Design a protein around this motif. Structure first.
Motif, PDB file in Angstrom:
ATOM      1  N   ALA A  58       0.825  -1.202   0.000  1.00  0.00           N
ATOM      2  CA  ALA A  58       0.000   0.000   0.000  1.00  0.00           C
ATOM      3  C   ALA A  58       0.863   1.257   0.000  1.00  0.00           C
ATOM      4  CB  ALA A  58      -0.935  -0.001   1.201  1.00  0.00           C
ATOM      5  N   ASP A  59       0.297   2.357  -0.485  1.00  0.00           N
ATOM      6  CA  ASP A  59       1.015   3.625  -0.540  1.00  0.00           C
ATOM      7  C   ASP A  59       0.882   4.383   0.777  1.00  0.00           C
ATOM      8  OD1 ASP A  59       2.657   4.761  -2.627  1.00  0.00           O
ATOM      9  OD2 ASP A  59       0.999   4.356  -4.011  1.00  0.00           O
ATOM     10  N   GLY A  91       7.247   2.088  -1.052  1.00  0.00           N
ATOM     11  CA  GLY A  91       7.122   1.091  -0.005  1.00  0.00           C
ATOM     12  C   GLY A  91       6.614   1.678   1.298  1.00  0.00           C
ATOM     13  N   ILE A  92       7.400   2.572   1.889  1.00  0.00           N
ATOM     14  CA  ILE A  92       7.024   3.207   3.145  1.00  0.00           C
ATOM     15  C   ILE A  92       6.624   4.662   2.927  1.00  0.00           C
ATOM     16  CG2 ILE A  92       8.590   1.708   4.416  1.00  0.00           C
ATOM     17  CD1 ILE A  92       9.418   5.365   4.296  1.00  0.00           C
ATOM     18  N   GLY A  93       6.513   5.057   1.662  1.00  0.00           N
ATOM     19  CA  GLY A  93       6.136   6.420   1.340  1.00  0.00           C
ATOM     20  C   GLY A  93       4.693   6.722   1.693  1.00  0.00           C
ATOM     21  N   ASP A  95       3.387   7.271   4.055  1.00  0.00           N
ATOM     22  CA  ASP A  95       3.031   6.634   5.317  1.00  0.00           C
ATOM     23  C   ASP A  95       2.389   7.636   6.270  1.00  0.00           C
ATOM     24  OD1 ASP A  95       4.168   4.286   4.336  1.00  0.00           O
ATOM     25  OD2 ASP A  95       5.077   3.798   6.277  1.00  0.00           O
TER      26      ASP A  95
HETATM   27 CA   LIG Z   1       3.858   3.288   1.948  1.00  0.00          CA
END
Ligand SMILES: [Ca+2]
Ligand SMILES: [Ca+2]
Ligand SMILES: [Ca+2]
Ligand SMILES: [Zn+2]
Ligand SMILES: [Zn+2]
Length: 164
Positions: A58-59, A91-93, A95
């Motif tokens: 997920a974004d 990936g962890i963006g 967030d």
């Molecule tokens: Ca993300």
């Protein structure tokens, strides 16, 4: 200036969200209820597509944390920094992080997760901040009936300025 400083937006119509953890301030149902509606307010103003997941890519990664939690931001617990997310990240963006210290609920009382969720995802998409006195991008937060809650001209103008 309803848009990040430049063009960090992925410029894609494919997005998703994954709640890392859940806060005891909200209900298992209220969490998905306020969220589903949050994404339904942005996915309707743009030809984009949002999806929910608990074990995928997920974004907008939602993670309710308190104060400093390894983000070089260090929240402020009760009151203050309600939440902060990213955008042009992989990936962890995008967030999204909500201050657990806060009282997230589905009513006018605590910080309505729905509203906070909508604006929360906006940043993860790559949106900036608006100067409108009623724009979601605005750094100001206020409770409002979902039936009346709607992205201001600035929000729709910006969100579409990179997706439209
Ligand atoms: Ca993300
Ligand atoms: Ca806070
Ligand atoms: Ca709390
Ligand atoms: Zn954080
Ligand atoms: Zn903001």
């Amino acid at each position: 200036f309803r848009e990040m400083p430049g063009g960090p937006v992925w410029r894609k119509h494919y997005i998703t969200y994954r709640i890392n953890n859940y806060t005891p301030d909200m209900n298992r149902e209220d969490v998905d209820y306020a969220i589903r509606k949050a994404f339904q307010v942005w996915s309707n103003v743009t030809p984009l597509k949002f999806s929910k997941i608990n074990t995928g890519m997920a974004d907008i990664l939602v993670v309710f944390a308190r104060g400093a939690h390894g983000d070089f931001h260090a929240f402020d617990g009760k009151g203050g920094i309600l939440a902060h997310a990213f955008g042009p990240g992989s990936g962890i963006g995008g967030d999204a992080h909500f201050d657990e210290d806060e009282f997230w609920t589905t009513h006018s009382g605590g910080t309505n997760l729905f509203l906070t969720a909508v604006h929360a995802i906006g940043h993860s998409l790559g949106l900036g901040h608006s100067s409108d006195p009623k724009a979601v991008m605005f750094p100001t937060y206020k409770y409002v009936d979902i039936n009346t809650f709607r992205l201001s001209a600035d929000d729709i103008r910006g969100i579409q300025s990179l997706y439209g």
